[PDB]
Amino acid sequence: EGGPALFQSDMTFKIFIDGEVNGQKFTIVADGSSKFPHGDFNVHAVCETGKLPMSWKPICHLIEPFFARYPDGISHFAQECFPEGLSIDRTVRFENDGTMTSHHTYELDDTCVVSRITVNCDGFQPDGPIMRDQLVDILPNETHMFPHGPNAVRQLAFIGFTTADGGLMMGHFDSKMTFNGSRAIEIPGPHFVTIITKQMRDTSDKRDHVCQREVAYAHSVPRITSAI
């Protein structure tokens, strides 16, 4: 198409995140592999600035939409964007807490996808559960994909995180993916991507790091053909 044809290969990825939270700079490098048919892959992410100043949990969406698994009959926008690439502009606004704003660029180097992300995490509560590292898991969710003009798609999500006291920190996620090239590209109709995420810490790597697994896949719902 021929972006989806490229993704019939096994691929690797590398992510460079330049971040700040409340004025304190951080750097994360991440890398991984994803074999066809994709939709289930791990990432190894390391904080290169010593110790991450906030919970690793909200970093989950920063550390590969083209590795989601799409069925027959839904257009896979992120994959169609290649070989030219795509950018992402994203907001995650946490209730009673700060807002993460990011800019993502993706380029293809043969079968490696290289990602550069700058993120500003501002207005975060120093005595809240993100900065106190009191977030215990990431709730699986049904993200909503929408056409967004001729060259973009918008992803909306409610991303929950369970707190150590058994409460819930809710992030309002709004992400626009934009095609970088001049050709016309097939914009999918409204659909969903289900995303399941889990982070783990091992003795393997001694650096501050997570190993995160994501299962991601697209689906539609049966439409109803009359009101009887």
Which has the closest alpha carbon to 134: 94, 164, 162, 161? Answer: 164
* Number of C-beta neighbours around residue 9 at 10 A: 11
User: Which one of the spans 11-19, 23-31, 56-64, 136-144 is the region binding its own copies (CB under 8 A)?
Assistant: 136-144
The site partner of 194 among Na ion, its own copies, none (C-beta below 5 to 8 Å per kind) is: its own copies
3-state helix, strand, coil in the chain (%, to 5): 5, 50, 40
- Which of 168, 181, 186, 207 touches its own copies by CB under 8 A? 168
Residue 3 main-chain phi, psi, to 5 deg: -70, -55
Residues 6+ apart with CB under 8 A from 223: none
4 in helix, strand or coil? helix
Q: Does residue 55 touch its own copies according to CB under 8 A?
A: no
144 forms beta bridges with 156, 192
Q: Does residue 14 touch its own copies according to CB under 8 A?
A: no
Q: Does residue 188 touch Na ion according to CB under 5 A?
A: yes
User: What is the β-pairing status of strands 168-179 and 86-94?
Assistant: antiparallel
The site partner of 144 among Na ion, its own copies, none (C-beta below 5 to 8 Å per kind) is: its own copies
C-alpha 25: how far from its chain's center? 21
30 forms beta bridges with 15, 45
Q: Does residue 146 touch its own copies according to CB under 8 A?
A: yes
Which has the closest alpha carbon to 107: 11, 214, 212? Answer: 11
Q: Which is nearer to its own copies, 97 or 106 (CB)?
A: 97
Q: Does residue 228 touch its own copies according to CB under 8 A?
A: yes
C-beta of 75: minimal distance to Na ion in Å?
Answer: 4
Q: Does residue 184 touch its own copies according to CB under 8 A?
A: no
Q: Which is nearer to its own copies, 132 or 198 (CB)?
A: 198
- The contact set with its own copies (CB under 8 A) reads 42, 139-142, 144, 146-147, 156, 158, 160, 168, 170, 190, 192, 194, 196-200, 211-213, 215, 221-224, 226-228
- The contact set with Na ion (CB under 5 A) reads 75, 188-189
